[PDB]
Amino acid sequence: SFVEMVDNLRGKSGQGYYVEMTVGSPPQTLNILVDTGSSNFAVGAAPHPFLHRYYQRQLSSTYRDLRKGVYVPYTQGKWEGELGTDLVSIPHGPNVTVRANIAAITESDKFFINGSNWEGILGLAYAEIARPDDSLEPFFDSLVKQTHVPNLFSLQLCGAGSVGGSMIIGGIDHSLYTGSLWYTPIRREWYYEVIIVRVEINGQDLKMDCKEYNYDKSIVDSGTTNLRLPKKVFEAAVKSIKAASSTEKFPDGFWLGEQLVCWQAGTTPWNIFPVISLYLMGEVTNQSFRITILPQQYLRPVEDDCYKFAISQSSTGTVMGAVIMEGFYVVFDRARKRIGFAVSACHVHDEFRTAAVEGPFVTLDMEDCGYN
Ligand SMILES: CC(=O)N[C@@H](Cc1cc(F)cc(F)c1)[C@H](O)CNC1(c2cc(CC(C)(C)C)cs2)CC1
C-alpha cells in the first residue's frame, strides 16, 4: 500500500536512512532520518557546521511555541532544543498533512554527521520513551489520530544493490518481498521490543539460557547500524565466528569494531564467515521462526574491498540494527502488536547461500526467554 512511497529512502552506509519531509507554511524541505529506536521528531533549527539547511520557525505561518524545552541523549550523540508544533507532510508518502510535535534543535553534540544529507530525525517508537515524557505525542501517533492512515508502516532497507529503500506508511506493499511474512509479538509498547528464543551460527545452537539473548531487552532499531548483542552473547558469537574463519587471522581492533580489514577486490572470502540464525517468538503457542543473516550483512563495507565487523557489545540488550534489517522487509504492525519479517526484493547476494525467513519451528517455554 502503495507505489508512491517505493524508494523514498536514501542514505550513506553507516549514517542511517532518511526520507524527505516538509514542515511549516510555506513548506520547508528537510531530509529526516527514520528511527524506530526512539520517539522524538526533532530537526536542525539553527546553524551547525554539518547542516546545509535547517528549520526556520519565524518563516512559518503555522508554527506554535510550546514554551517548554527538551533534550535527548542517544547511545553517543545528543541534542537539546525547543518544543513546538507545526504542519508536517511526507512528499513521497501518503497524501496528508498533520500537526505534529517537533523539537527545534538549538544545540547538539555528536548528533549531526559530516557526510550527511539529513537535517533531523523521526522517532517512530512509542510515547513511553519519548522526552521530556510520555505526554509528548509521537509523530506516527498524531498522523494516525488525525487521518485515516492505518496504524502500520513497513521498512525495506536496501544495502547498495550509497543505500536506498522504502518506507511504506499505512501498509504493506506486496511488491517489496517474496515468500511469507513471519510475525513476532511486540512484547511491550515502548521500543519495538521482541523476544529471541534461539540463536545458531552455521547451524550450531549457541546453547545459552534463552534469557541471555534478551538481557535486558531485544529491540528492532533502524537508527542503530550494527547488530548489538549482550556481553555474554557477544562473547559466544565472536568466539564461533573467530573459529569458523580461523583459516585467516585478523587484528583485535577488527573484532572490537574499530579497524577495517581488506582483501583484493573480488576476493573477499565470504564462505569462511558463518551465517547467523535468530529465532523469534511466533504467533502461536510453542511456535517460532528464524531469520538468517549472511556475512554480507554483518561485514559492512567501508571505502580493494574493505569492511568493518558490524556486530558490537551491548550493556543495554540486543539491538537488531540496520544491518540486520537490510535485505528483509520488516512490517511494524502496531495495530496488531506485531512485527513481520519477509525476504526483501533487495536481498543480499551470495552465490551459494541466502538470507531466509523460515518457519514454523517448535520451541518450548518461549515465555521463559523474556528478561523479568
Ligand atoms: C546510534 C544511535 O544512538 N542511534 C539513535 C538514532 C541516532 C542516529 C544518529 F545518526 C545519530 C544519533 F546521535 C542518534 C537511535 O535512537 C538509538 N536507539 C536506541 C536509544 C534511544 C535512546 C534515546 C531515548 C529513547 C532514551 C530517549 C537512547 S539509546 C535504542 C538504542
- Give the CATH number for residue 343: 2.40.70.10
Q: Is the CB of 366 under 6 A from ligand 1?
A: no
Claim to verify: residue 100 and residue 222 sit in the same structural domain: no
Claim to verify: residue 361 and residue 216 sit in the same structural domain: yes
Q: Which three cell numbers stand for residue 227?
A: 547488530
Claim to verify: residue 107 and residue 173 sit in the same structural domain: no
In a domain, 244, yes or no: yes
Last residue of a domain, one of 94, 116, 149: 149
In a domain, 131, yes or no: yes
Last residue of a domain, one of 92, 117, 149: 149
In a domain, 262, yes or no: yes
Distance in Å, CA 50 to ligand 1 centroid: 19
Experimental method: X-ray
Distance CA 24, CA 125 (A): 23
Distance in Å, CA 74 to ligand 1 centroid: 4
Claim to verify: residue 73 and residue 215 sit in the same structural domain: no
Claim to verify: residue 126 and residue 210 sit in the same structural domain: no
Q: Name the domain count of the chain.
A: 2
User: Is 305 known to be catalytic?
Assistant: no
Last residue of a domain, one of 123, 149, 175: 149
Range of the domain at 232: 150-372
- Residues with Cβ within 8 Å of 115's Cβ and at least 6 positions away in sequence, in order, are 12, 15
Claim to verify: residue 161 and residue 292 sit in the same structural domain: yes
Ligand 1 nearest atom to the CA of residue 77, by list position? 13
Distance CA 177, CA 150 (A): 20
Q: Is the CB of 224 under 6 A from ligand 1?
A: yes
For the chain, the three-class secondary structure string (H helix, E strand, C coil) is: CCHHHCCCEEECCCCCEEEEEEECCCCEEEEEEEECCCCCEEEECCCCCCCCCCCCHHHCCCCEEEEEEEEEECCCCEEEEEEEEEEEECCCCCCCCEEEEEEEEEEEECCCCCCCCCCEEEECCCHHHCCCCCCCCCHHHHHHHHCCCCCCEEEEEECCCCCEEEEEECCCCHHHEEEEEEEEECCCECCEEECEEEEEECCEECCCCHHHHHCCCEEECCCCCCEEEEHHHHHHHHHHHHHHCCCCCCCHHHHCCCCCEEECCCCCCHHHCCCEEEEEECCCCCEEEEEEECHHHHEEEECCEEEEECEEEECCCEEECHHHHCCEEEEEEHHHCEEEEEEECCCCCCCCCCCEEEEEEECCCHHHHCCC
Claim to verify: residue 267 and residue 346 sit in the same structural domain: yes
301-305, long-range: CB within 8 Å, 24+ apart, which pairs? 301/13, 301/160, 302/13, 302/14, 302/260, 304/262, 304/263, 304/264, 304/265, 305/262, 305/263, 305/264, 305/265, 305/266, 305/267, 305/268
Distance CA 322, CA 293 (A): 12
Q: Is the CB of 117 under 6 A from ligand 1?
A: no
Q: Is the CB of 35 under 6 A from ligand 1?
A: yes
Q: Is the CB of 111 under 6 A from ligand 1?
A: yes
In a domain, 12, yes or no: no
Looking at ligand 1, which residue's alpha carbon is closest to its atom 1? 224
Claim to verify: residue 218 and residue 349 sit in the same structural domain: yes
Q: Give the β-pairing of 177-185 and 204-205.
A: unpaired
Ligand 1 nearest atom to the CA of residue 39, by list position? 25
Looking at ligand 1, which residue's alpha carbon is closest to its atom 18? 37
Claim to verify: residue 109 and residue 161 sit in the same structural domain: no
Distance in Å, CA 235 to ligand 1 centroid: 23
Claim to verify: residue 168 and residue 116 sit in the same structural domain: no
In a domain, 322, yes or no: yes
Q: Which residues of 185-204 are buried (b: 16+ CB within 10 A; e: fewer)?
A: bbbeebbbbbbbbbbbbeee
Distance in Å, CA 205 to ligand 1 centroid: 31
Q: Is the CB of 200 under 6 A from ligand 1?
A: no
In a domain, 8, yes or no: no
User: Is 7 known to be catalytic?
Assistant: no
Distance in Å, CA 289 to ligand 1 centroid: 28
Q: Which residue among 75, 217, 313 is best mutated to probe the pocket of ligand 1, counting the most ligand atoms within 8 A of its Cβ?
A: 75
Claim to verify: residue 122 and residue 245 sit in the same structural domain: no
Distance in Å, CA 223 to ligand 1 centroid: 6
In a domain, 197, yes or no: yes
Strand partners, 104: 43, 82
In a domain, 263, yes or no: yes
Claim to verify: residue 202 and residue 186 sit in the same structural domain: yes
